[PDB]
Design an enzyme around this catalytic site. Structure first.
Site, mmCIF file in Angstrom:
data_model
loop_
_atom_site.group_PDB
_atom_site.id
_atom_site.type_symbol
_atom_site.label_atom_id
_atom_site.label_comp_id
_atom_site.label_asym_id
_atom_site.label_seq_id
_atom_site.Cartn_x
_atom_site.Cartn_y
_atom_site.Cartn_z
ATOM 1 N N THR A 121 4.307 -3.316 3.348
ATOM 2 C CA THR A 121 4.870 -3.117 2.020
ATOM 3 C C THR A 121 4.351 -1.863 1.331
ATOM 4 O O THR A 121 4.823 -1.536 0.238
ATOM 5 C CB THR A 121 4.581 -4.335 1.137
ATOM 6 O OG1 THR A 121 3.198 -4.335 0.761
ATOM 7 C CG2 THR A 121 4.898 -5.622 1.884
ATOM 8 N N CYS A 122 3.384 -1.163 1.928
ATOM 9 C CA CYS A 122 2.950 0.110 1.364
ATOM 10 C C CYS A 122 4.091 1.117 1.370
ATOM 11 O O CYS A 122 4.302 1.839 0.389
ATOM 12 C CB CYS A 122 1.749 0.650 2.139
ATOM 13 S SG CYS A 122 2.060 0.955 3.894
ATOM 14 N N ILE A 123 4.840 1.173 2.470
ATOM 15 C CA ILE A 123 6.070 1.943 2.567
ATOM 16 C C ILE A 123 7.252 1.070 2.963
ATOM 17 O O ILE A 123 8.348 1.582 3.191
ATOM 18 C CB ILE A 123 5.914 3.127 3.542
ATOM 19 C CG1 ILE A 123 5.461 2.632 4.917
ATOM 20 C CG2 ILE A 123 4.936 4.152 2.986
ATOM 21 C CD1 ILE A 123 5.264 3.738 5.929
#
Ligand SMILES: [Zn+2]
Ligand SMILES: [Zn+2]
Ligand SMILES: [Zn+2]
Lengths: 261, 357, 441, 58
Positions: A234-236
């Protein structure tokens, strides 16, 4: 405040309130037509009543069981008995003055029972955002921003979804795999698609437009592996999926994965 | 490396828009010309009321021909769009020729000779009002000059008109707000029509879309046109597709300075921007949805002010970015996946941090 | 004749001669294809009656209900009589073949009726009732269907080979001439002003057809209703004039007879009210003829080779214009201003450049692809070549794909330049002006 | 103002005549500037010119 933060953070936090709720949240003016969004059954009842009001036989209908300024409040309101109009217990409802009462009936549930909650919500919203940025918006823009797409749909997923492969063993195989994946995803109904995007980008509500997704979607199709579940970050919001030549096993395993919370 | 007639025409139209906007802005100074110009700038020219009104009829008498040209063009394209919508809501999607057919998109995914013959036949049929059951051949994307001139004239009208500036059954609470009201058209009666047609958005909570017309969102309003209780050339409804007859229509249509009181009468009748917009509502929304990279940047454009959802969301996102670049604290949250402790931590932290008399 | 004899003696108590004759010759509520005159005009004979057995070119319909498929093909003649109502259809790929519905179903077209009696019955039914104004099941008038049959027969009957003099016994009889009824029927029906008025005025405010979205508008809103009411119908009229001018090149007497009838109808003095009606008929007809002439003159090229100086379609158009000069010139002027207004108003829609046909054979294309089209049918009740892509930041040129779908029909996104479209429109205007001048001279 | 508006109307009509008459000479696309320096530029070449000099002698 969390709604306003999701607005500010360009994130979709699905809290889909009723139309009048967000209309009075913005400090706009409530109206009668929002009753259509409120409860279509009672809206239709009031519409039929106001239609009969024009007819001269409405009082004859009032001669059926002697209607008056009294209604049976539901258990949601808390029970008890609240007088609709002062000194209206003895006075029956008349077609010559029903219209005003009709308006009251709307605010009898839109505002009479819902003054403090909506007032507090608007007051809290005003203390996290400026007044100027609040305007130019309406119920529809607010709904398309907060709730995102009204449902989770595959076409808007295709609108923002980039596929790359680090192997390049075959373009035809890659296309066939992605076609099968999109086809099986399309057959998924509402809640399963919600969970699928809850595993895709941790939010079942897709962004309204191309903008709204802070990272760029990216899915890497790795060479096939017999035992390797797709990974997501979920960071990218990036996905990694093996080139599963076997289809249904991958479909079922991803379905059970997105089933898990 | 292109040298396309359309871009030269568009640049000429943009110059025309700028000069017309300057004319209108100057005329906006007339009411306060004895305080904005004749008292601030040491060099000013005195003006007289009679000369002022003569000047105003002069500007009207000079703008009349291009105004008639724009009226004819916009009327023809709006009529053709309205006919397209009417036939789309009255035709079988199965046939290849229907508007709401995936083969007529022409943008997501045939011969030149065929295209020119189609355009020639479309013009020949449209001239004599003989255009039933087959869609018109028009490229509303090839009228950017018309877009700019329409915008300029609408800006002039709005500037001068603004410079000039009910209960019981029609109770204030039973009237639509800016959310659902349509300018230039009488709002539909909230009583006769039921929910399924008057407010289709209430019936289906999924009709919302990033590409969602306000019309299907909130039903079809009505307009007071045609000869019924009307005896004016403009009031005659636009049910005529071509541009030759729609050229002979508007052609045959024919004291202190602080009280200048512009009139904008122009075409012999008092012109209000609301009704004019209502005349070309389909073409206005289509122009706002096709041409927005160029006509949008022009200040005070009618399309930008009346823009669709995309303009609103883009503006709000830009405002978010602007307002997010001066704070010094993040959320700095610390929560857990549970329910009770999650809520308790949320309320305690948010009250302790952002709480003070 | 017995029906006339019976109807002549009737009590008029809520009864009429026509209300007792129409309901007994074509009773109300009947399906259009059962109308007596349409059956009269679609009887003909089967192709097998003159094609022998070997493959001779003819269109190919498949009758899925009766089983004919995959090298079992029924012809166009049998698609209206033998297979009237089956799940018949037309094959886009049409290899040469021959009809074989006789061996797989009951081909009721094997033998013909009496020709003289057929003509007499056509005469009587045309002069008797108003069954000619009603379209058949395909929303096309009797005249348009007749002209299309004439156009097909003209090109298909040249293949007839006389039985030159120079085992199998169950084969159907195949030694008779192809049907000649279409030409005679069109010649006889063009002389009845009721039929001519119906055909030319087809698509008006009053006349409507089931195969047209303008028929059922009652459920629509008033705005849509008026928008659809204002525009008259011309697709059928353009089809008729195209088929009579461009297609049926075998004969010239058809348009001569049409013009003779219109001339008889315009000059009338004794009968009242015929002047306005005949003027309107001739005006609409000349407008459609001008459309056809303009298109098939634009497509062709003014080649100096062979000094032809006149092609056949433009020749028919010239004869028509000469015959009806005083009104032809007015209609041509109307069409000219129609063509030229966008040129001078600065709105010339872009169009890609194109070549020009060196002969009429290539010119007939495009014109056939456009005129021979059918209206939009009404909305009922209330290997993949196109793949999908998932890409971002795909902004090359563009600017026309962001509009709402309901209007995207009218918005477009190897030149396609304003100037060449304007030039082509101007050339069309020049052709119209030259024809105007040559007529006026 | 009283004469400025007149001259501006005349100039606007001058510019718009080809647009509403369809006679414009084609021109290639270009990108608008965003700074005053480029506003001065281009205009410098357009304005700062000398007329066609006379043919010397005869
Ligand atoms: Zn046959
Ligand atoms: Zn059959
Ligand atoms: Zn047969």
């Amino acid at each position: 405040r969390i709604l306003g933060l999701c607005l500010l953070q360009n994130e979709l936090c699905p809290i889909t309130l009723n139309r009048h709720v967000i209309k009075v949240l913005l400090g706009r003016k409530v109206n009668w037509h929002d009753f259509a969004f409120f409860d279509p059954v009672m809206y239709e009842s009031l519409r039929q009543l106001i239609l009969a009001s024009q007819s001269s036989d409405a009082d004859a209908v009032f001669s059926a069981m002697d209607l008056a300024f009294a209604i049976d409040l539901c258990k949601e309101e808390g029970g008890g008995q609240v007088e609709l109009i002062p000194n209206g217990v003895n006075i029956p409802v008349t077609p010559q003055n029903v219209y005003e009462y009709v308006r009251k009936y709307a605010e009898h549930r839109m505002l009479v029972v819902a003054e403090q909650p909506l007032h507090a919500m608007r007051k809290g919203l005003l203390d996290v955002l400026p007044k100027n940025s609040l305007e130019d918006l309406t119920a529809e823009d607010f709904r398309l921003l907060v709730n995102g797409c009204g449902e989770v749909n595959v076409q808007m997923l295709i609108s923002f979804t980039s596929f790359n492969d680090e192997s390049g063993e075959n373009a035809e195989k890659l296309l066939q795999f992605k076609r099968w994946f999109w086809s099986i995803v399309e057959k998924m109904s509402m809640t399963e698609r919600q969970d699928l995007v809850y595993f895709w980008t941790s939010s079942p509500s897709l962004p309204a437009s191309e903008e709204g997704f802070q990272p760029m979607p990216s899915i890497t199709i790795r060479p096939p592996d017999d035992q390797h579940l797709p990974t997501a970050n979920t960071c990218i919001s990036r996905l990694y999926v093996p080139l599963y030549s076997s289809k249904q096993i991958l479909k079922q395993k991803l379905l059970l994965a997105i089933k898990t919370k | 490396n292109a040298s396309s007639y359309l871009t030269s025409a568009s640049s000429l139209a943009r110059a025309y828009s700028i000069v017309i906007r300057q004319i209108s802005d100057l005329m906006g100074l007339i009411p306060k010309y004895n305080h904005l110009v004749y008292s601030q700038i040491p060099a000013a020219v005195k003006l007289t009321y009679q000369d002022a009104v003569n000047l105003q009829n002069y500007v009207e008498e000079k703008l009349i021909p291009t105004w008639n040209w724009m009226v004819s063009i916009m009327d023809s394209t709006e009529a053709q769009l309205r006919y397209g919508s009417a036939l789309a809501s009255a035709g079988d999607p199965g046939h290849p020729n229907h508007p709401l057919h995936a083969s007529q998109n022409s943008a997501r995914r045939m011969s030149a000779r065929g295209d020119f013959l189609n355009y020639a036949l479309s013009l020949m049929r449209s001239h004599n009002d003989e255009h039933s059951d087959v869609l018109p051949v028009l490229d509303v994307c090839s009228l950017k000059h018309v877009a700019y001139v329409f915008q300029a004239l609408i800006y002039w009208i709005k500037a001068m008109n603004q410079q000039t500036t009910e209960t019981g059954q029609n109770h204030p609470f039973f009237r639509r707000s800016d959310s659902m009201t349509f300018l230039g058209c009488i709002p539909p009666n909230p009583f006769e029509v039921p929910l399924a047609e008057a407010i289709p958005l209430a019936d289906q909570p999924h009709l919302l879309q990033p590409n969602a017309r306000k019309e299907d969102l909130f039903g079809r309003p009505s307009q007071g046109l045609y000869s019924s209780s009307a005896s004016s050339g403009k009031c005659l409804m636009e049910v005529t597709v071509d541009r030759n007859c729609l050229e002979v229509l508007p052609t045959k249509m024919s004291p202190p300075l602080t009280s200048f009181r512009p009139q904008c009468s122009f075409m012999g009748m008092v012109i209000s921007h609301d009704m004019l917009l209502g005349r070309w509502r389909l073409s206005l929304e289509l122009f706002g949805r096709v041409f927005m990279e160029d006509v949008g940047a022009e200040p005070g454009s009618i399309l930008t002010e009346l823009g669709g959802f995309e303009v609103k969301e883009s503006k709000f996102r830009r405002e978010m970015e602007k307002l997010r670049n001066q704070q010094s604290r993040d959320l700095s949250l610390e929560v857990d996946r549970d329910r009770d402790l999650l809520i308790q931590q949320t309320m305690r932290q948010l009250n302790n941090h952002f709480g003070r008399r | 004749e017995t029906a006339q004899k019976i109807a002549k003696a009737e009590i008029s108590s809520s009864e009429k001669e026509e209300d007792v004759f129409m309901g007994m010759v074509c009773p109300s509520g009947t399906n259009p294809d059962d109308s007596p005159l349409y059956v009269l005009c679609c009887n003909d004979t089967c192709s097998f009656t003159w094609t022998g057995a070997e493959h001779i070119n003819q269109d190919i319909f498949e009758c899925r209900t009766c089983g004919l498929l995959e090298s079992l093909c029924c012809c166009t003649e049998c698609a209206r009589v033998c297979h009237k109502g089956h799940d018949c259809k037309l094959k886009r790929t049409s290899p040469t073949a021959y009809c074989d519905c006789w061996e797989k179903c009951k081909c009721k077209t094997l033998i013909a009726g009496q020709k003289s009696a057929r003509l007499d019955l056509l005469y009587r039914l045309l002069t008797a009732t108003n069954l000619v104004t009603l379209p058949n099941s395909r929303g096309e008038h009797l005249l348009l269907f007749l002209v299309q049959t004439v156009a097909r027969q003209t090109v298909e009957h040249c293949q007839y080979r006389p039985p030159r003099i120079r085992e199998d016994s169950d084969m159907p009889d195949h030694d008779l001439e192809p049907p000649r009824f279409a030409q005679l029927a069109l010649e006889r029906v063009l002389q009845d002003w009721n039929a001519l008025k119906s055909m030319i005025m087809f698509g008006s405010q009053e006349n409507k057809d089931p195969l047209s979205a303008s028929s059922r508008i009652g459920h629509l809103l008033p705005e849509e209703q008026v928008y659809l009411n204002q525009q008259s119908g011309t697709i059928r009229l353009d089809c008729f004039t195209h088929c009579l001018i461009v297609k049926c090149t075998a004969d010239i007497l058809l348009l001569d007879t049409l013009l003779g009838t219109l001339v008889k109808e315009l000059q009338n003095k004794y009968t009242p009210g015929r002047r306005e009606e005949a003027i309107a008929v001739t005006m609409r007809f000349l407008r459609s003829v001008a459309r056809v002439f303009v298109i098939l003159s634009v497509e062709m090229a003014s080649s100096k080779k062979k000094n032809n100086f006149i092609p056949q379609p433009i020749g028919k158009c010239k004869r028509v214009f000469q015959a009806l000069l005083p009104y032809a010139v007015e209609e041509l002027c109307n069409v000219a201003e129609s063509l030229i207004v966008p040129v001078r108003m600065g709105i010339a829609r872009p169009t890609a450049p194109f070549t020009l046909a060196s002969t009429s054979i290539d010119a007939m294309q495009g014109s056939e692809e456009l005129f021979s089209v059918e209206p939009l049918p009404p909305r009922p009740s209330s290997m993949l070549d196109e793949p999908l892509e998932r890409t971002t930041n795909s902004s090359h040129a563009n600017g026309a794909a962001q509009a709402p779908r309901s209007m995207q029909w009218a918005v477009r996104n190897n030149a396609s330049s304003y100037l060449t479209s304007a030039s082509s429109l101007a050339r069309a205007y020049s052709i119209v002006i030259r024809q105007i001048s040559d007529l006026m001279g």
